Design a protein around this ligand. Structure first.
Ligand SMILES: O=C(O)C[C@H]1C=CC(=O)O1
Ligand SMILES: O=C(O)C[C@H]1C=CC(=O)O1
Ligand SMILES: [Mg+2]
Ligand SMILES: [Mg+2]
Lengths: 371, 371
């Protein structure tokens, strides 16, 4: 085919971050991305990104295993295939490859980037058409220090960078974390929306009390308080919690989204291209959530500019993202591999109408930071 | 510690098989294993095996990615740790590594082999004590030809090799697969037990009819008829099916076993060390099943001698394996990496009382077959 895929290269890139990021199960000291370079016969290159958090501390795919499985299994399946038919290509992968959503996400992003360049349309238009050009962006407070978090939040407010804050908790004693969260909300007052993310750290026995306390103290959303394995517990917590609960880790594929909606496991769903298998699969998850009356949140796995924009282009097509987004990945990184970084200002990420993902590689930065 | 782990080597080995093995989603032409060689400071080496089917066509871990994740993440966590405290070592892995059960299974198998040699006890005794020395072994008919399958079954029966047969279906038109299964049962009659495995291939709409037909035609068990994602459907099928349904792919961790039991998704559970994370994790899944009144089946991912014996030692401790086992993996291989293959005779696999997994590596064959 004229647009036949000729090569697929995966490159692991290590990048520095602005400060340590403490999750309930891991403290990030930096970040690693997997770049996908997909070239077609018509002389078009598509760029994609597969990124996770803390090696295998967060999910089952590591930057390393992602490269291994793409090179050994994905590449052989797609080389020679028509890059202009994205649906056919991704379904071809799905029939021979189980799981590996992070890898699939990077591959589809690259195909979409290439296809956008091929038609001279931004990805958002390939996906149906945008209903907005800007997306609100929340910021995560996870320095591990209450005073430091409050100061950072106030700074983002003064600089008009962010006004929605996500607090990582679950690593310490419950009462200590709650006091931490309550203190932050008290200091910010109505100037900001404060939410928490427990990353599955609590047992239901602890969450049933903690959620009641958070809800009574102005916390707007409680993300994945307990293990995705306590299916019945998540349902029960939705009933006892005066604050809405959001599913994140509970969604590891589109089918999970349906089952959670069926069971009533959460009233808000985080949307992550890495967890669903790309922008298109993520839109199927959003469609399921919308059909069920579940709120949407534009999530991230802390990707750099490529993965962040691949996510953004999908979110631009959604009628409503009631809980906003957390597309701040490129801002947590002190360095990326793009010639120009995504555009952030006045609490939002502004997406251009340039072809594909509207970005270009900084060959020099890539060559320097690539592993 | 005197038993500190000093090194962990992972070796991918490609071995030849006796014939094409046709699964609903993939046809095997040979088998690939990942050998784990774990050496301790006290001069003891433990051997383990992590094996899957068809690259990524069956699960999210490939022999390739298993080696990558063990070398890059598991090794660093374990080198220096006391090899004689298996529980502490595996929990150490669990707190930093999500998923990767196939990899974990190989690691724990190696640790068990080493600890068995260290104490001069077979792995079955380390796990509490065996209640039998032999395990009944079923045989999978998957040549893709009715006449050939019947002939092979008749050969295995008359050789007193196997009298329980598992038929893989789901790759063809439903009525064609049903005719195939029924023809086989009709040819063997009461001399053998015939069961099927659909590997999630059917939609519930198809299964609700197909299960009734199979149950009305002498088929004893229906393994994973539909997708593990149709949770509500598996429950509904248990009610309409006159033949018991066994969960296999639905179990990808111990927690899944609990949820399936809670929901009533199957009346029999397949037990696979690769799906649970090793012999010990599999015994926890077995405990959950027993506590729920669910039948047990000794499953396999077509492991060679090492993985099969690691599985066998755990199954020897179970009070009852109502649905027997399918530990025939070594019989599918024309050459393995064990000095002496497992002992099969009179419809059973006979396990010795030798220390550890009671086996010795065939260094010559390892050197010849390794990548
Ligand atoms: O929250 C997660 O599970 C993943 C990621 C999103 C932002 C962040 O701080 O971590
Ligand atoms: O069936 C499976 O799921 C895995 C394995 C067990 C025997 C066999 O033929 O394949
Ligand atoms: Mg989260
Ligand atoms: Mg099976």
């Amino acid at each position: 085919h004229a647009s036949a895929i000729e090569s697929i290269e995966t490159i692991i890139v290590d990048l520095p971050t602005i400060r340590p990021h403490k999750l309930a199960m891991h403290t990030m000291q930096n970040q690693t991305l997997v770049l996908i370079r997909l070239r077609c016969a018509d002389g078009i290159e598509g760029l994609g990104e597969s990124t996770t958090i803390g090696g295998l501390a967060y999910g089952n795919e590591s930057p390393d295993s992602i490269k291994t499985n793409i090179d050994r299994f994905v590449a052989p399946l797609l080389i020679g295939q028509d890059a202009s038919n994205i649906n056919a290509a991704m379904l071809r992968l799905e029939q021979s490859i189980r799981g590996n959503t992070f890898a699939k996400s990077g591959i589809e992003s690259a195909l979409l980037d290439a296809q956008g360049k091929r038609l001279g349309l931004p990805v958002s238009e390939l996906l149906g058409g945008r209903v907005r050009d800007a997306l609100p962006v929340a910021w995560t407070l996870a320095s591990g220090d209450t005073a430091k978090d409050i100061a950072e939040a106030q700074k983002m407010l003064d600089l008009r960078r962010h006004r929605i804050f996500k607090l990582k908790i679950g690593a310490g004693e419950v009462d200590r974390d709650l006091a931490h969260v309550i203190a932050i909300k008290k200091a910010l007052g109505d100037s900001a929306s404060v939410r928490v993310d427990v990353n599955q750290a609590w047992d239901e026995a602890v969450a049933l009390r903690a959620c009641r306390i958070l809800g009574g103290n102005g916390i707007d959303l409680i993300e994945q308080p307990i293990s995705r394995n306590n299916r019945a517990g998540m349902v029960r917590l939705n009933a006892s919690s005066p604050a809405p609960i959001m599913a994140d880790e509970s969604i590891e594929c589109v089918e999970d989204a349906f089952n959670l909606a069926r069971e009533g496991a959460a009233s808000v769903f985080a949307l992550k291209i890495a967890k669903n298998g790309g922008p298109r699969a993520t839109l199927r998850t959003a469609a399921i959530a919308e059909a069920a009356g579940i709120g949407l949140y534009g999530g991230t796995m802390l990707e750099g500019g490529i993965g962040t924009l691949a996510s953004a282009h999908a979110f631009l097509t959604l009628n409503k993202l009631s809980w906003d987004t957390e597309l701040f990945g490129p801002l947590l990184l002190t360095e990326d591999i793009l010639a120009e970084p995504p555009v952030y200002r006045d609490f939002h990420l502004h997406v251009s109408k340039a072809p594909g993902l509207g970005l270009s590689l900084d060959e020099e930065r890539l060559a320097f930071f690539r592993r």
